[PDB]
Write a protein that binds this DNA or RNA. Structure first.
Lengths: 215, 94, 444, 68, 99, 181, 264, 349, 38
RNA sequence: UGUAACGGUACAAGCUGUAAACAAAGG
RNA sequence: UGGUUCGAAAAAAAAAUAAAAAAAAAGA
RNA sequence: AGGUAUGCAGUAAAA
RNA sequence: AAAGGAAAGGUUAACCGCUAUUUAAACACAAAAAA
RNA sequence: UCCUAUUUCCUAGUACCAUUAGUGAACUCAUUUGGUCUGAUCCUAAGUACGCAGUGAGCUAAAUAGAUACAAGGAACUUGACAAGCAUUAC
RNA sequence: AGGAGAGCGUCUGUUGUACAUCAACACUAGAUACUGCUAAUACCACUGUGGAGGUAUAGUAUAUAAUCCCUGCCCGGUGCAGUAACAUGUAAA
């Protein structure tokens, strides 16, 4: 529908507006209403050339307002209509932060609608269980080695500003006391990795007896 | 006709019946030159399993076929002949 | 249709195994992008045949042919030596664009023909006022890649870039500064001028993708001024998300070099930036496979015969150690080949000197082996063992790595040929020693 | 549905004695919201329970009135 | 009884007592060796991933080794193929035999 | 059903998985593991610990935990516990089975060629029903009402009524064996 | 209608683990292969050039190896032949294979001529004996051979199941506290001596505990894997090259018969 | 069907050649000399010239009849299922048909281009492949070796994989006495042995033949089914008379080629299915009787309770189907000497 | 009707269609599909 | 020609085309 | 992670869609 | 037993 | 036994096709014509 | 100078479109609580180291649908053992 | 839904969704008839398609059906075959 972008513009007509989201957005992210036909490259070049913004990433969604039926008022016409317009919601991740009071909505009338406060601890849809892919530090490549805190260079860089020992970050109100390794205990309490420490004694491997009648 | 590769011409075989004379070693004359190999392969590809006969008015003794000798029809069925308002465009325009 | 029950079961099992094979196959493809970019705005619109007779070629034709061959990986020795002969014949009649494309082809293909660069550089210097950003960048880039060092001409190229700052492309300027730093061609005044210009270029003209190319530890250690260092280290924290393992590795090396050699600058950084780099030190930065060279293996063999436990080609911190002894971990060795120096000279590279100084100041006792001296030993093992023993019996090398004696291209070529012959002989008499040759057949 | 195109109104033409309240699920959701607010120092339940024009700072109430 | 046991174990979790369990005889409530069958499946998947990585490494290394100085060459057949092509009168030449 | 198309063996199979036939030796084989002269390439352990599972025999002393990386199962792993080996609804007595839809323990046997089954409702108690089924099966075996478990005494005793029935049949068809009719 | 595929496959596979185990059996042990043993040998001709040439140049050998009877062929490599055969033996083998190929090519195209027939007969018999010394009755797959040699038997697999190393010497940064049975296979078709087979632990087995979870109780070849299978003094380098009528196992030494070997 | 090669490739009334030549020599003259040499060599090798009769076939069959390690070790197969015989002992190959000599069969399921059912009582059956069998035996004067015998799901006889002396593979119809290792050839100089293909004019009287060409070079069309065969009765210069399996005596041009022997798998007729399921697998559908339907559906239908046909038997389409001849009266007999009569008359006279 | 543009549904979109339906919104082209899904 | 989809306009059975209700005063 | 795209294989066309706008002098 | 990461043509073989 | 996949792509081979072709990205490195 | 070669090779920021990643027929249909219960499978489970779900109030009449327990008789019922009954009961 | 028996269909199957789950239909097999290949038969644009890329141990049509013993007499009638037309043949026509 919108006119296709020419190779040379000289007079852009596209309107980039700030969109106030009812969901949560990170520190360096901002949501914009944009024409549907623009690409991520077009959006990034537009922002870097007209505003000088230092854009790192652009993510895009297409938003189509839902169908609505006029059913309520006196003498209602039961006709279908849409509120607003179809548009591209562009979430731009920049080098610098954007104020929460700008990017997100607030309310003292409906106290539950404070995404800047609730953050990602809530899903702002019908989604019940939040799905999050593993973090960059949790990945292997470019991830955080779980024994690097014992190496010389990290300790040389830490100085007195940081303490790298993970034992210092244990939450007292969540962890349990250490058990005796020679007695029945759970693996999930204090190990937090997918292998068996050698300090745990030899374990019995039990194979099911599927045909007892034969013996 | 299928010609296997020149590096593995020996196809799987059953045990030869007792008393059968030994087969001579294969003569791979078509491996001297790649051009000869390609020409031989194309020639082999030109072969056909059989050739079929068909009605052709250009042949003196050609003929076509009508309907069955008895002259009856499917029981209880009054077949409607094709027209311009019935089965008009089935499988081809005209 | 239907299948016989055995056939049903076998084909169903095959389908299940194919599905599981696909799932297992796609497991490690985290960094596989279906959308991919290809650069093609440097390709010329004219057509050329690369095998055409050189005597019919002019500058415009030969430059395009060289660049096309480099792009197509048509690395034929006869073709490229014909290119060299014709280009040297046509040296008088090349524009800066043609010379830039020629240098691009040579550097990209890593065709280490020193004579062509030596013969083309004077015309580059003479024609510098007419050069443009791409040509300057390409000349510096090719020289750095092939290790052809001409400090005067590199400094002149940098000065020309400074004079044309308003016309230079930001990426070209960044690459020129990096090449100047790696070749060690900028005295303090030129270094200050380049740092001053690069500061503004990065602050005003470069987004994250362009800026990340400025993060080079050699330049940070030897060229950049203190404000530029602070700005670069602060900006990397903001631009990390768009970086790759090479950028992360160079940022980490820059941070370590600043910490070890410029504690004042390290302290002038802020706590948040220092925290960023401390946390970076904890990450698994993907390296790439490294293996001992033939010379490295020969040195390891001689050392083992001498009787010193050691390990080879391992990573400590943000450095790769050639040889690290086991009994006394602080003792380490470095085997220095032809590419560790500048062509036709025994002068060490800036990266090598920086690594030597940083490791020495962090505590390593470094000893070094020079191929120019090793090659004179031949295939003898007693001589090599005595050489290594005598080196061991002497103190480690200073924190500042000094250059070796003078040499020439003639001697470099002679030594390269001798090394080729020695490699051949050693491989032959290794595999022959391995072969038993004990089964004798009474077939005759 | 919201556009009222389904036939879900057909059952609502007949009486039913009652309806499930899903209180377990709804209370889990409500407590999740409450925890999200409380980790930042907000007493959403107290705010919801406050009378019109009533001001209570901290975790205070009628018991605070009694003992103060 | 399940509710009572769960209450007690959760109470110990909340208190932060050591993660101990009843050690006695746990009855077997299932028939299938799901643990080991799934482990075998995971083994196969890991082998397949390793095989893909090997294939990729070999592909790239083969290309790069093919393109090397002193190895790569531009060559053409020693004898011109015009001399070794089939003469037009050859019986096997196209069109020279009945089809 | 005991099909003729199920596999013979009921074990867990770990087939030998060969690599594509033209791949060269993997990277970790270039490692030098002499204590005096060491070189450990990149991804040495990652590659080798997966290559070791190829043969299907050396699965690892901790199999399948050495290939199970998901924490969903490690979170459930227990230590120093004693586990049973038998599903609670399986009886060692031959011919005892469980029908879950009916909630019964069935005893199936063969007696005089006929295939017979009896039900034991489990609503009265799983253990009680299973033990009743086992006791019924053992009583049948002892009394000789299961063909394959019969003894010489049982065979001799049954032959008497077999003989009586056979004599009745002989009298039934007497007129044919004599040559009349 | 849907175009979902790959990880979004719309096929409703079963999740029953027992059924999937049966599927594994059907997909690996009972898989059907179209190609033949000579097809596999030709596929690997570049690495087994000498044996490929012998198979294609010695009369009768191809017929013997193309027969339906399930067979196991132990294929040596050209590298194996070069390493283990003496230079004179290798030269003789190459010359005789070339001679047979040359006679075949002559067919395609006094006493001196008479001697050619005798030489051809002698060479054909010798090379046929050599090649058929590697052909074995029956289909012996790699896992079957390992289980016959005893690997996988808890009573016998000791010295192959709990290999360990001096860890601190190779992964020191993780060990600061330490920084302080012969099976017999039927004889080759051209001989009567049954073939011995055994197993050994590879040098890579000891390093498993360094990088894997273990449950232990209280020169060297570079071939991969944890277990090495040796056949008649020769190591299997690539096994389970399955075919329709047998299996090919790649080995690193030729199994020369005693008759063809030289006593002095 | 016509779902394979197009009409332009399949249809040709008059074939202009009978020898599919594949010369090796550089020139036409040398090719002709080589062809003459090959013909002379075949003539020299040929020694048998007596007719091949039913009795000689029986003698050869009698002679052929008179004249634990081999398994997959450690492979426990299915619980109950097992092949009837191991691969090294089965009469047929037990393997798979060559992929390069076959293609997937297009199953029309008894429906024509109109989509209606024209051939009744047809079912899907088991998946099948069409294999390209050389009905022409175009290659002449080149010997081939029978490597194996194979099952064919579309054909009542067995196939044989022929490897020519130059390595060419093909499939031919197997004879009752064809065995692996047999040597076969197609030529006018060939000996009279089973499997050899000769012109009908070079085959002595009383010989038994199969795969007979109606037109020279067009591929055999007559006598193909398993166990079938035809007998050479009389010969003249231009025509040869054959008695066919239907008891029809017909003349054939002396230049039409044919193969000596009986078609393999003579025991096909002895097969017993035992259940409807075997025919279901084979591709059949139930046949509802005409008199079981309503009068609108068949002439024999109708009538309270069961009844007889109530008239001389007729088909669904009102044509007498017991004794009523259907061959076109005006269609000339041509080379047909005498056509068979009803089986009742044949067996009673 | 229960399928199509009736009842305010309007023209079909990939959001409302099954996977496989191809319909954009008017963006310019910036490259080429490869033969292997890239 | 006619009609429609989206978009703008009082979120529309009107008007209208990203210049989406208005240029009429230019070397 | 899928669709798209090559194949199956399709004008067997999902109106307002595209690697899909007059199609190389493209000004490197 | 669909297609996997410089990409268009193009022949053969095949767990 | 009822007789069962081969189009495109990857692998290996062969190859006198071509920017309709791998960064003007980078790391590593005793390494290579003619004379 | 005894590794089958001692062979440089990480991730080029990445077009357009889809996705609420969980319980649950979630489809056609409509007396549509989406979600519990009504069946196999999916975690070596003391029901999976406290999970998912739980709808106005009263009130001894009969009749009905069921559940349990029936003395002694035991098919005498009915067109017909239909429906029921047995297949639990010291341990 | 046990023990001992009879009837009808051999059997496993199909079956009228929503009044018929049956003794009705099919069925393994024994017969008869047609059909020499551009076969007959079917579809009824007819130099076309299925049959069939099959070739009388094949294909199509109509009964009767799986296992054992049996299956009597009639060609006057009707149909069909046979011949120039007769004669004559054919009933598991």
């Amino acid at each position: 529908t919108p006119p296709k972008t020419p190779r040379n513009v000289f007079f852009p007509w596209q309107v980039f507006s700030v969109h106030r989201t009812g969901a949560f957005l990170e520190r360096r992210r901002v949501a914009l209403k944009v024409p549907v036909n623009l690409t991520k490259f077009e959006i990034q070049s537009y922002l870097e050339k007209i505003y000088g913004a230092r854009v790192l990433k652009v993510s895009t969604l297409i938003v189509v307002p839902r169908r609505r039926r006029d059913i309520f008022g006196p003498r209602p016409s039961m006709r279908y209509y849409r509120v607003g317009c179809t548009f591209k919601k562009a979430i731009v991740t920049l080098e610098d932060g954007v104020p929460d009071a700008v990017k997100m909505l607030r309310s003292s009338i409906e106290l539950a609608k404070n995404p800047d406060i609730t953050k990602h601890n809530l899903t702002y849809s019908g989604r019940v269980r939040a799905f999050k892919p593993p973090s960059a530090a949790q990945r292997w490549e470019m991830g955080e080695s779980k024994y690097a805190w014992r190496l010389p260079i990290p300790n040389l860089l830490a100085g007195d500003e940081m303490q790298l020992n993970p034992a210092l970050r244990i939450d007292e109100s969540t962890t349990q006391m250490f058990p005796d390794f020679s007695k029945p205990f759970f693996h999930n309490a204090h190990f937090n990795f997918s292998w068996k420490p050698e300090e745990v004694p030899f374990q019995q491997t039990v194979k099911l007896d599927i045909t007892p009648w034969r013996r | 006709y299928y010609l296997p590769s020149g590096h593995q011409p020996h196809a799987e075989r059953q045990v030869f019946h007792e008393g059968a004379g030994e087969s001579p070693p294969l003569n791979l004359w078509w491996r001297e030159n790649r051009e000869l190999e390609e020409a031989f392969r194309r020639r082999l590809g030109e072969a056909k399993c059989f050739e079929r006969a068909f009605a052709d008015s250009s042949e003196p003794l050609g003929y076509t076929k009508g309907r069955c000798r008895g002259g009856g029809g499917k029981s209880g069925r009054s077949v409607r002949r094709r027209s311009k308002t019935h089965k008009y465009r089935e499988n081809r325009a005209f | 249709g239907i299948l016989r029950p055995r056939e049903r079961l076998l084909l169903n099992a095959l389908k299940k195994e194919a599905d599981i094979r696909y799932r297992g196959r796609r497991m490690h493809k985290r960094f596989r992008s279906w959308a991919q970019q290809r650069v093609r705005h440097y390709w010329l619109p004219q057509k050329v045949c690369v095998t055409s007779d050189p005597q019919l070629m002019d500058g415009s034709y030969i430059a395009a042919c060289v660049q096309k061959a480099a792009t197509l990986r048509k690395h034929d020795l006869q073709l490229w030596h014909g290119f060299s002969k014709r280009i040297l014949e046509l040296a008088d009649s090349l524009t800066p664009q043609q010379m830039g494309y020629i240098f691009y082809g040579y550097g990209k293909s890593l065709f280490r023909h020193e004579e062509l660069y030596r013969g083309l550089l004077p015309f580059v210097a003479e024609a510098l006022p007419e050069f443009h950003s791409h040509a300057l960048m390409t000349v510096a880039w090719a020289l750095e890649r092939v290790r052809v060092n001409d400090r005067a001409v590199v400094a002149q190229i940098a000065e020309e870039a400074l004079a044309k700052k308003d016309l230079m492309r930001p990426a070209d300027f960044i690459k020129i500064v990096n090449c100047v730093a790696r070749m060690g061609a900028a005295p303090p005044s030129l270094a200050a001028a380049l740092s001053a210009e690069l500061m503004r270029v990065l602050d005003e003209k470069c987004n994250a993708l362009l800026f990340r190319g400025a993060v080079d530890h050699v330049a940070v250690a030897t060229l950049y001024s203190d404000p530029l260092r602070l700005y670069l280290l602060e900006r990397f924290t903001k631009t990390a998300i768009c970086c790759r393992p090479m950028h992360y590795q160079k940022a980490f090396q820059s941070a370590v070099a600043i910490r070890v050699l410029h504690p004042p600058v390290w302290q002038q950084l802020s706590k948040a930036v220092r925290n960023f780099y401390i946390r970076l030190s904890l990450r698994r930065i993907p390296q790439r496979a490294r293996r001992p060279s033939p010379l490295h293996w020969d040195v390891s063999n001689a050392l083992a015969k001498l009787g010193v436990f050691h390990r080879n080609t391992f990573q400590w911190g943000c450095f790769w150690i050639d040889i690290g002894e086991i009994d006394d971990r602080r003792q380490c060795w470095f085997v220095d080949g032809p590419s560790d120096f500048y062509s036709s000279t025994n002068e060490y590279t800036e990266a090598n000197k920086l690594q030597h100084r940083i490791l020495s100041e962090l505590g390593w006792n470094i000893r070094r082996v020079r191929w120019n001296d090793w090659v004179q030993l031949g295939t003898d093992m007693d001589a090599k063992v005595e050489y290594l023993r005598k080196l061991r019996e002497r103190p480690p090398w200073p924190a500042i790595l000094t250059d070796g004696p003078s040499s020439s291209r003639q001697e470099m070529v002679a030594n390269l040929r001798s090394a080729r012959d020695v490699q051949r002989a050693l491989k032959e008499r290794r595999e022959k020693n391995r072969q038993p040759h004990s089964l004798v057949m009474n077939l005759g | 549905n919201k556009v009222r195109t389904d036939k879900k109104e057909r059952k609502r033409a007949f009486p039913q004695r009652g309806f499930w309240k899903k209180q377990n699920f709804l209370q889990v959701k409500n407590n999740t919201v409450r925890l999200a607010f409380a980790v930042q120092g907000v007493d959403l339940l107290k705010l919801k329970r406050l009378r019109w024009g009533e001001v209570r700072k901290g975790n205070t109430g009628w018991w605070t009135d009694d003992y103060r | 009884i399940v509710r009572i046991r769960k209450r007690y174990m959760g109470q110990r979790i909340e208190a932060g007592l050591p993660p101990y369990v009843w050690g006695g005889p746990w009855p077997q409530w299932g028939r299938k060796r799901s643990l080991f069958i799934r482990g075998e499946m995971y083994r196969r998947m890991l082998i397949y991933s390793f095989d893909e990585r090997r294939r990729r490494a070999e592909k790239l290394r083969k290309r790069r080794q093919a393109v090397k100085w002193g190895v790569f060459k531009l060559r053409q057949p020693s004898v011109p193929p015009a001399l070794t092509a089939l003469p037009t009168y050859h019986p096997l030449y196209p069109g020279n035999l009945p089809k | 059903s005991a099909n003729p198309y199920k596999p013979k063996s009921r074990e867990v199979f770990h087939p030998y998985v060969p690599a594509p036939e033209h791949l060269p030796p993997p990277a970790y084989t270039t490692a030098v593991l002499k204590p005096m002269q060491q070189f450990i390439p990149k991804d040495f352990y990652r590659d080798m610990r997966v290559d070791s599972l190829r043969d299907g025999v050396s699965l690892g002393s901790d199999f399948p935990w050495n290939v199970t990386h998901k924490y969903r199962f490690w979170r459930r792993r227990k230590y120093n516990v004693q586990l049973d080996d038998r599903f609670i609804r399986l009886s060692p007595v031959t011919g005892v089975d469980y029908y879950p839809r009916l909630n019964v323990f069935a005893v199936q046997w063969r007696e005089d060629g006929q295939h017979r089954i009896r039900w034991f409702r489990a609503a009265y108690g799983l253990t009680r029903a299973m033990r009743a089924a086992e006791n019924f099966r053992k009583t049948l075996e002892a009394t000789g009402r299961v063909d394959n478990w019969r003894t010489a005494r049982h065979l001799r005793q049954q032959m008497l009524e077999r003989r009586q029935q056979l004599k009745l049949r002989k009298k039934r068809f007497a007129k044919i064996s004599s040559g009349q009719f | 209608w849907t175009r979902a595929s790959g990880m979004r496959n719309p096929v409703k596979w079963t999740r029953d683990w027992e059924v999937l185990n049966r599927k594994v059996y059907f997909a690996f042990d009972e898989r059907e292969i179209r190609r033949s043993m000579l097809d596999a040998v030709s596929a690997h001709r570049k690495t087994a050039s000498l044996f490929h040439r012998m198979i294609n140049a010695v009369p009768g050998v191809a017929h013997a190896m193309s027969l339906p009877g399930p067979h196991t062929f132990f294929l040596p490599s050209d590298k194996a032949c070069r390493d283990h055969l003496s230079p004179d033996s290798l030269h003789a083998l190459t010359e005789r294979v070339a001679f047979l190929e040359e006679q075949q090519r002559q067919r395609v195209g006094g006493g001196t001529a008479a001697a050619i027939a005798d030489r051809v007969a002698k060479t054909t018999e010798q090379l046929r004996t050599f090649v058929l010394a590697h052909l074995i009755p029956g289909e012996w797959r790699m896992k079957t051979l390992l289980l016959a040699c005893g690997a996988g038997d808890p009573r016998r697999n000791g010295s192959l199941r709990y290999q360990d190393t001096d860890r601190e010497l190779f992964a020191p940064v993780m060990y600061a506290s330490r920084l302080g049975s012969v099976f017999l296979l039927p004889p080759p078709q051209s001989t009567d001596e049954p073939l011995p087979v055994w197993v050994q632990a590879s040098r890579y087995a000891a390093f498993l505990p360094i990088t894997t979870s273990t449950n232990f109780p209280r020169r060297r070849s570079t071939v991969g894997g944890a277990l090495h299978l040796w056949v008649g003094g020769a190591l299997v380098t690539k096994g389970d090259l399955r075919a329709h009528n047998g299996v090919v196992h790649m080995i690193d030494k030729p199994l020369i018969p005693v008759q063809l070997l030289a006593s002095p | 069907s016509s779902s394979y090669l197009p009409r332009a490739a399949t249809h040709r009334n008059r074939v202009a050649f009978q020898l599919f030549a594949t010369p090796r020599e550089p020139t036409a003259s040398k090719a002709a000399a080589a062809a003459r040499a090959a013909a002379e060599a075949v003539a020299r090798s040929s020694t048998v010239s007596a007719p091949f009769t039913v009795q000689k076939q029986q003698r050869l069959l009698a002679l052929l009849a008179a004249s634990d390690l081999f398994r997959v070790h450690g492979l426990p197969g299915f619980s109950g299922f097992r092949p009837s015989s191991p691969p090294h002992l089965s009469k047929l190959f037990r393997g798979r048909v060559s992929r390069h000599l076959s293609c997937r069969r297009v199953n029309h399921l008894g429906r024509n281009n109109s989509g209606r059912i024209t051939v009744r009582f047809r079912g899907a059956g088991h998946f099948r492949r069409l294999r390209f069998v050389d009905y022409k035996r175009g290659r002449k004067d080149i010997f081939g070796t029978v490597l194996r015998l194979e099952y064919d799901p579309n054909r009542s006889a067995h196939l044989a994989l022929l490897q020519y002396d130059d390595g060419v593979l093909s499939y031919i119809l197997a004879t009752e006495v064809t065995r692996p290792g047999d040597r076969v050839v197609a030529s006018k100089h060939a000996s009279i042995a089973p499997g050899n293909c000769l012109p009908l004019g070079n085959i002595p009287v009383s010989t038994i033949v199969h795969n007979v060409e109606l037109r020279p070079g067009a591929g055999g069309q007559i006598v193909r089914a398993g166990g079938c065969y035809a007998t050479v009765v009389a010969k003249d210069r231009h025509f040869v008379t054959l008695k066919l399996s239907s008891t029809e005596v017909r003349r054939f041009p002396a230049d039409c080629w044919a193969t000596v022997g009986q078609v393999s798998n003579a025991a096909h007729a002895e097969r017993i299915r035992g259940k409807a399921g075997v025919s279901y697998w084979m591709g059949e559908r139930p046949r509802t009787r005409g008199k079981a339907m309503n009068p609108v559906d068949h002439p024999h239908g109708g009538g309270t309770g069961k009844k007889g046909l109530k008239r001389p038997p007729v088909s669904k389409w009102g044509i007498l189907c017991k004794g009523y001849k259907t061959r076109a009266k005006k269609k000339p007999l041509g080379l047909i000497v005498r056509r068979k009569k009803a089986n009742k008359l044949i067996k009673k006279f | 009707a229960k399928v199509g543009p009736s009842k305010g549904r309007g023209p079909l979109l990939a959001k409302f269609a099954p996977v496989g339906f191809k319909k954009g919104f008017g963006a310019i082209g910036l490259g080429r599909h490869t033969k292997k899904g890239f």
